[PDB]
């Protein structure tokens, strides 16, 4: 069944779901250097945006082939950010806490 | 502007090889800060480079 090839470092975006409960995986939990995966049953909803109304520009380089770069920002610039609901994150992190305590 | 009281992006201009090989032209664009690096062997801040 179709997997999602998304690139992402710390949080696995747009992923599938655990069917029953939060589960944890490691080659061996004794080795602290090993990655520890955590999988969630309840999806935490993350929304990100870059509200600077960036505009496209088309410089051209040598024969024919163009090169694109940012032109003037229309509007007043604002920070790029990501939003996560606090109660969802707190509850989910605490549940991951109990699942870690199942091994610790 | 105001020594970092802002969500800044830097503006920069540069010379490009236009459609004619030996009649280069000036151009302007803008880049986010992680993709610009200081160039000068001294403390000088006037001249910059792509991070590549």
């Amino acid at each position: 069944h179709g997997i999602r090839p998304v690139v992402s470092t710390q949080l696995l975006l747009n992923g599938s779901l655990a069917e029953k409960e939060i589960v944890i995986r490691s080659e061996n939990l004794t080795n602290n250097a090993k990655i520890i995966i955590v999988h969630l049953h309840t999806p935490v909803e993350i929304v990100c945006t870059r509200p600077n109304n960036n505009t496209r520009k088309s410089v051209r380089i040598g024969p024919g082939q163009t090169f694109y770069a940012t032109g003037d920002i229309i509007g007043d610039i604002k920070q790029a950010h990501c939003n996560i609901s606090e109660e969802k994150w707190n509850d989910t992190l605490q549940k991951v806490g109990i699942e870690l305590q199942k091994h610790f | 502007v105001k020594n970092g009281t802002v969500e800044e992006m830097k503006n920069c201009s540069f010379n490009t090889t236009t459609e004619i090989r030996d009649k280069e032209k000036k151009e302007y664009a803008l880049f986010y800060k992680p993709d610009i690096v200081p160039l000068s062997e001294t403390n000088n801040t006037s001249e910059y480079r792509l991070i590549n």
Partner: antibody
Framework: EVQLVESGPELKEPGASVKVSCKASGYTFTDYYIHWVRQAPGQGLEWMAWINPTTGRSSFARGFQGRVTMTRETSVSTAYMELRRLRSDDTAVYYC????????????????????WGQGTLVTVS | QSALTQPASVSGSPGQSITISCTGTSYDVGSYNLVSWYQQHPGKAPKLIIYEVSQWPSGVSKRFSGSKSGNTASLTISGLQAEDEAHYYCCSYAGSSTVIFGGGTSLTVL
């Protein structure tokens, strides 16, 4: 509490620069866009420009693209604007007013609601 | 005047209900919902009404409810009292971070 104050009315020659001024009171001057608008005597309204009082960046009407100048005075709770290349047609009343809150994460520059006006000031062209 | 259009004058007797229209284009008002209206008696700065399409700024009562549809917007001057005789203006957010005003209007003297 809130009261916007402006300089007195002026008389000018064509092609001059009009230093219209706008001083604030009764609110944190750094937390709200100050927003400009024009009105010819006995006619409708015409938008002018934005200015972020904390950052100084601005954009303004295409109709005045020839030359317009802006300034923000954080320590004075006052902002300036300057119509330059003054025509006889540009004679009008000029206002400044308090527009939407400057969100740290949303481009509020654009929301046309402004709920506190200055008293108004005009320039005559002769 | 600019592209934002508004009727020149609308009239009516006391107790009537009137809609002052405001028209734009798909670019500006047909794509964004930031429409506001302003009231002005002559010789003074205008005063805001409807800070956002329908919401209410202050103790102005329900007599000026707004509405929008496509490139059109309306100001529902209702329960008319003749002392409200004044100029009324449309305005809305537009392209390129600009703001534009409607042509203005004149209310009843009847």
């Amino acid at each position: 509490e809130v009261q916007l104050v402006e300089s007195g009315p002026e008389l000018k020659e064509p092609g001059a620069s009009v230093k219209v001024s706008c001083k604030a009171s009764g609110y944190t001057f750094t937390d709200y866009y100050i927003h400009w608008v024009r009105q010819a005597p006995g006619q409708g309204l015409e938008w002018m420009a934005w200015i972020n009082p904390t950052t100084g960046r601005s954009s303004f009407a295409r109709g005045f693209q020839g030359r317009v100048t802006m300034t923000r005075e954080t320590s004075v709770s006052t902002a300036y604007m300057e119509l330059r290349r003054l025509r006889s047609d540009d004679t009008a009343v000029y206002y400044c007013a308090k527009a939407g809150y400057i969100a740290l994460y949303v481009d509020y520059s654009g929301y046309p609601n402004f709920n506190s006006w200055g008293q108004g000031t005009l320039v005559t062209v002769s | 005047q600019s592209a934002l259009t508004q009727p020149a004058s609308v009239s009516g007797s006391p107790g009537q209900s009137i809609t002052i229209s405001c028209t734009g284009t798909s670019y500006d008002v047909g794509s964004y919902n930031l429409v506001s209206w302003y009231q002005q008696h002559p010789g003074k700065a205008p005063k805001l009404i409807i800070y956002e399409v329908s919401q209410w700024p202050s103790g102005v009562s329900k007599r000026f409810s707004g509405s929008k549809s496509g490139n059109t917007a309306s100001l529902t001057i209702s329960g008319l009292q003749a002392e409200d005789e004044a100029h009324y203006y449309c305005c809305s957010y537009a392209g390129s971070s600009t703001v534009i005003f409607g042509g203005g209007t004149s209310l009843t003297v009847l």
